[PDB]
Amino acid sequence: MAKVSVLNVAVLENPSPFHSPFRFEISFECSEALADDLEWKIIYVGSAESEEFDQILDSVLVGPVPAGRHMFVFQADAPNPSLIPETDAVGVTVVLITCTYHGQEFIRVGYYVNNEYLNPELRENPPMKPDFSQLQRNILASNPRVTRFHINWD
Template identity: 40%
Template structure:
């Protein structure tokens, strides 16, 4: 809706332990903007990340446990949007899925993501704190019913 003075940072995070703060593993991050700043209007970019390492998956309880993955959007170090997914690994063979081998066969696993869960946070943008809150209320009114496509 408005040009921003600084870039937006997007981070792809893997949750290794949902009960421990700060234990998330950053898989990738990018700055989006005109360096510095983001112009007004629709912005398109491609954000790709590699998968978590086997050790990160094992730290989250192993490949057959449910873990988490989220994309986080930050402006001036403040998170304003998070798109989260539950992640599980299934065997590509129903027989293996029902009766998993004692030793994990990583070559037969596939990653399955849940439907996205979008959370928005209020932050001060480029205005004073009070004016920023008013602008956020106006923006949220405009975002009701919007759909995030991933």
């Protein structure tokens, strides 16, 4: 049974301009000290259609992990709009926070992200080519989806 349990994720600076960084405050419990690193990563799903348009915004390492309750702040640069299909640029998608030990993902937190124009005319008539300077990214941080996977510690 697992050595790490996420207590919380705080979505910070939300909503925000599409280009502003993602800011997360992650709190977790460690029941048994980890000698090696935990790898946390933030994933923007670019297109619902394919797993191929997913962007890894950043990745950080944490460790050794002593036992107890801990926090770190995970910030990452907003996704690169050149890689997002125009159809999917506006409207809903998903961002994911994930954690890995000895190569196996043991947890995946996910949030629905809405990319929306704050400009009433644009909302009415969006340009074929989406303008990302006009898009606000609202993360729904009231409905995280926490998904756990059994992994081998040691």
